[PDB]
């Protein structure tokens, strides 16, 4: 009946049962860091590969890292951002909003439908990975999509509502879901405990690559700072020819839950962006953008970025944006005060700083110090080169992008 019950029923079938399906799971990073708490341990006290082993012991045929999906979201959203910027430089509006939090998307559709054109058309990391698994991977393995089950483990009590949006399906059959069942961190922790699985005592297991070949999770060593930051990095590095360091956002005075940064961008010498800048000098009235120039004509643009945590705080930001008192070009809205590490499906703690501990243990110090870039991932490159085409192209649009419905679904 429940989605947990349905997923477990699929896993309960012997692997040689004629009605057995190919049961896949993907795991969010916020789940990996918090799952140890379900055993009464500290965040990060169990390793990612111990979790992978635990999931394989439940019977999953494939065990994926949602970060693979996030590399797709970075490719698409980075390209989408650069495209909106390019169109506006040469005279899909700006500012652009992120779209990965279903709590934001619900409030958008119900209370701010006039803002729909400003929102990124990207699906979330979990939905992009799911779309890929029941298209590319199904084909590769010679499995009918109807014989694939996709399960995600999320820190979030809203991700099932995201997965359930009707058109997230295979070949216009709304009963053939791209993503079937979402299980929360605590629900998974309970499943393990009910079965006498102690993650902390497991050997290291292995991840599967959603490409269906090669070792590991199909994601390179290192960190990105998350999809919004890496989308900015994608756009910035193409625009300027220079690397964007890890961002450090600053709190906004007088606005709760809002952080910001400004990113100055000079176009690369000889680039189209350099040409556009010189040669061509709604509800959210754009202000034409923030620009600067120098005496010799080396002009640039300043990208103004905001992150809102908490939907109440986001409502106050939107009011100020509509008034023209807050001026931003790219805005992320997340429903949870602490973001996904503090999601509604996470363990409950008496520790007032538990989300800080989760954030700190989210990735190890070795990887924290190393910046990775999604477009350099050979698995991602191969997927675009041999299957998807170009970011924002027809196939990528079909599988990886979405739309919004005024009034909600
Ligand atoms: S911020 Fe909260 S509601 Fe939004 S995706 Fe993350 S866990 Fe879910
Ligand atoms: Cl996601
Ligand atoms: Na593997």
Cβ(73)–Cβ(124) below 8 Å: yes
d(C-alpha 391, C-alpha 79), whole Å: 7
62: which strand partners?
A: 24
Is the Cβ atom of 155 under 6 angstroms away from ligand 1?
Answer: yes
Pick the ligand that lies closest to the CA of residue 211.
3
Q: Which residues contact 259 (CB under 8 A, 6 or more apart)?
A: 249, 250, 251, 252, 306, 307
Gyration radius from the chain CA atoms? 21
| 148 and 230 together in one domain | no
Q: Which of 96, 27, 15, 33 is nearest to 68 (CA)?
A: 27
Is the Cβ atom of 103 under 6 angstroms away from ligand 1?
Answer: yes
Question: Which of the listed residues 29, 160, 336 should we mutate to test ligand 1's pocket, taking the one with most ligand atoms within 8 A of CB?
Answer: 336
> DSSP letters of 176-245?
EESS-EEEEHHHHHHHHHHTT--GGGSPP-----TTSSSSS-S--SSB-S-HHHHHHHHHHHHHHSSPPP
In the structure encoding, which two tokens stand for residue 19, read together? Answer: 């009605």
Helix (H) or strand (E) holding 153: strand 148-154
In a domain, 214, yes or no: no
d(C-alpha 173, C-alpha 112), whole Å: 30
Pick the ligand that lies closest to the CA of residue 63.
3
In the structure encoding, which two tokens stand for residue 110, read together? Answer: 């119900």
246: which strand partners?
A: none
Residue 104 CA: which ligand 1 atom is closest?
A: 4
Q: How many domains does the chain have?
A: 2
Q: Which of 165, 160, 136, 138 is nearest to 149 (CA)?
A: 138
d(C-alpha 259, C-alpha 26), whole Å: 30
> DSSP letters of 113-156?
GGGGGGB--BPPHHHHHHHHIIIIIHHHHT--GGGEEEEEEES-
**Ligand 1 centroid to 158 CA: how many Å?**
7
| 244 and 315 together in one domain | yes
**Ligand 1 centroid to 242 CA: how many Å?**
32
Region for residue 257 given its phi and psi (left: phi exceeds 0; alpha: psi -120 to 50; beta: otherwise): left
CATH number at residue 102: 3.40.950.10
| 263 and 378 together in one domain | yes
**Ligand 2 centroid to 219 CA: how many Å?**
16
| 163 and 294 together in one domain | no
Q: Which domain holds residue 140?
A: 1-66+124-202+338-370
| 261 and 313 together in one domain | yes
Atom 6 (ligand 1) nearest CA: 340
d(C-alpha 230, C-alpha 272), whole Å: 22
In the structure encoding, which two tokens stand for residue 76, read together? Answer: 């698409």
170: which strand partners?
A: 173
| 138 and 226 together in one domain | no
| 196 and 119 together in one domain | no
Structure resolution, Å: 1.6
> Would the annotation count 336 as a binding residue?
yes
d(C-alpha 369, C-alpha 334), whole Å: 25
Pick the ligand that lies closest to the CA of residue 216.
3
């Amino acid at each position: 009946l429940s989605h947990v019950q349905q997923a477990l029923a699929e896993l309960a079938k012997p692997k040689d049962d004629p009605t057995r399906k190919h049961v896949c799971v993907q795991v969010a990073p916020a789940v990996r860091v918090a799952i140890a708490e379900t055993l009464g341990l500290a965040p990060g006290a169990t390793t990612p590969k111990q979790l992978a082993e635990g999931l394989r012991r439940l019977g999953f045929d494939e065990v994926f890292d949602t970060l693979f999906g996030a590399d797709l979201t970075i490719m698409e959203q980075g390209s989408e951002l650069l495209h909106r910027l390019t169109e506006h430089l040469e005279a899909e509006p700006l500012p652009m909003f992120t779209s990965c939090c279903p709590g934001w998307i619900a409030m958008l559709e119900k209370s701010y439908p006039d803002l729909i054109p400003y929102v990124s058309s990207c699906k979330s990391p979990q939905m992009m990975l799911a779309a890929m698994v029941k298209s590319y991977l199904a084909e590769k393995k010679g499995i009918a999509p109807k014989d694939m089950v996709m399960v995600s483990i999320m820190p979030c009590t809203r991700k099932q509502s995201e997965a359930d949006r009707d058109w997230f399906c295979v070949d216009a059959d709304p009963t053939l879901r791209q993503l079937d069942h979402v299980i929360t961190t605590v629900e998974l922790g309970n499943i393990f405990k009910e079965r006498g699985i102690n993650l902390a005592e497991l050997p290291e297991g292995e991840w599967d690559n959603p490409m269906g070949v090669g070792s590991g999770a199909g994601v390179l060593f290192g960190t990105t700072g998350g999809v919004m930051e890496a989308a900015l990095r994608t756009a910035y590095e193409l625009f300027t020819g220079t690397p964007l360091p890890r961002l450090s956002l600053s709190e906004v005075r007088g606005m709760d839950g809002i952080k910001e940064t400004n990113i100055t961008m000079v176009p690369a010498p000889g680039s189209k962006f350099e040409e556009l800048l010189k040669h061509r000098a709604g509800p959210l009235a754009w202000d034409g953008g923030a620009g600067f120039t120098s005496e010799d004509g080396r002009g640039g643009i300043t990208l103004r970025v905001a992150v809102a945590n908490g939907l109440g705080n986001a409502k106050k930001l939107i009011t100020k944006m509509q008034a023209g008192e807050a001026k931003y070009d790219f805005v992320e809205i997340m429903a949870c005060p602490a973001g996904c590490v503090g999601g509604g499906g996470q363990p409950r703690s008496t520790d007032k700083a538990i989300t800080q501990k989760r954030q700190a243990a989210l990735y190890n110090l070795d990887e924290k110090s190393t910046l990775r870039r999604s477009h350099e991932n050979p698995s991602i490159r191969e997927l675009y080169d041999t299957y998807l085409g170009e970011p924002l192209g027809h196939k990528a649009h079909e599988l990886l992008h979405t739309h919004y419905v005024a009034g909600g679904v």
